[PDB]
Amino acid sequence: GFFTVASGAHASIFVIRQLPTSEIRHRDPIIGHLIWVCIALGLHSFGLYCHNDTLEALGRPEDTFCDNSIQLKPIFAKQFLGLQPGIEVLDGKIVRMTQELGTADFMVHHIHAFTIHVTLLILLKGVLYARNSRLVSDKLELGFAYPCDGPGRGGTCQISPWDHLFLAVFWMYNCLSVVIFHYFWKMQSDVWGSYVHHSSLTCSHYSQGDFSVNSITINGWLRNLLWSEASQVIQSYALPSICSYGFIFLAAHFVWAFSLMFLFSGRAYWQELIESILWSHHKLKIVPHIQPRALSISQGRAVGLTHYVLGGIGCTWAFIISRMLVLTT
């Protein structure tokens, strides 16, 4: 994900510094159709989850999208290995097992496609509209990394390719978090675990195969994956092995929240606060000749993005690693 957003960034830089290719001359249809496909994908894919949530809450499981109810079979997801029936085991563990795809896999894969397409939309818009646009016609003169062009024309905030990356990084992080959660839950529920005894084995999975039944709802994701599987990391303080992981969980939550400061606030408030503070220093004759300044707009965005991504990644890192370490030992 990080290197893909990087490729988008440096594509934008190349467009700014050099002449672009001729596919930029019909950029409006390209980005328009990408916008439409993003909207349609998000609507359908996420609204299936929302429909499942609402109907299940109302008490109508027969109306939801699931294997027992209306089912969205992934017809195109076909085997190619041609493996023999069964699973491969090694000393009380399942080294290899076929992943069986159903409505949950259909829904999660289309969520993946939606998020990938939205990230691609942000990156491609930044690349194609880097030199100029209907809003501002001298974006090339403005450069690559500028905060805006002004409050004019309604407001030209984050029109630069740098800001387009600044948003595409958020979207890449969202996509990768969903991918990580999908992989983690699916592997725990349907692949990993132990077995209990031509011989037939009953496979006891770590998550107990709850992905196919609970993953069909956002509430199921919230309960069976985050809340239920955060027991290890949340209750890791006394345990010698993973107390560090619990503390890092807490600290990553703190850092992620602290990023919202920079992501929501603006330069002028902090500059005025700094001046008011500096009044007292000048009063007491503490005169810093490297005059304090509030972080620039682009720097504030960068700091917020860095802290946001780092905190989220740290929370996920600690959560998954604590769960795995405890379960395997």
Ligand X SMILES: CC1=C(C/C=C(\C)CCC[C@H](C)CCC[C@H](C)CCCC(C)C)C(=O)c2ccccc2C1=O
Ligand Y SMILES: CC1=C(/C=C/C(C)=C/C=C/C(C)=C/C=C/C=C(C)/C=C/C=C(C)/C=C/C2=C(C)CCCC2(C)C)C(C)(C)CCC1
Where in 238-297 is the site for ligand X (CB under 6 A)?
261-262, 265-267, 270, 294-295, 297
Which string of x and - marks every residue 127-146 that binds ligand Y (by CB under 6 A)? x-------------------
Helix (H, G, I), strand (E, B) or coil at 139: helix
Which string of x and - marks every residue 8-37 that binds ligand X (by CB under 6 A)? ------------------------------
DSSP state of 221: I
The least CB distance from residue 252 to ligand LHG, in Å, is 10
For position 145 contacting ligand X by CB under 6 A, the verdict is: no
Amino acid at site 212: S
Where in 245-284 is the site for other proteins (CB under 8 A)?
271, 282
CA distance linking residue 241 with residue 230, whole number of Å: 15
Binders of other proteins: how many residues, by CB under 8 A?
A: 7
CA distance linking residue 89 with residue 91, whole number of Å: 7
Q: Do residues 299 and 255 make contact, with C-beta atoms less than 8 angstroms apart?
A: no
Binding region for ligand CLA (CB under 6 A) out of 5-13, 52-60, 77-85, 133-141: 77-85
For position 287 contacting other proteins by CB under 8 A, the verdict is: yes
β 194-196/94-96 pair status: unpaired
What is the end-to-end Cα distance of the chain in Å, rounded? 31
Which string of x and - marks every residue 293-312 that binds ligand X (by CB under 6 A)? -xx-x--x------------
Report in angstroms the alpha-carbon separations of 323 from 91, 101, 328: 21, 24, 9
Task: Pick the binder of ligand CLA from 13, 108, 165, 305 (CB under 6 A).
Answer: 108
Would residue 70 be called left, alpha or beta, if left means φ above 0 and alpha means ψ between -120 and 50 degrees?
beta
When the beta carbons of 102 and 300 are compared against other proteins, the nearer one is 300
Binding site for other proteins (CB under 8 A): 271, 282, 285-287, 289, 291
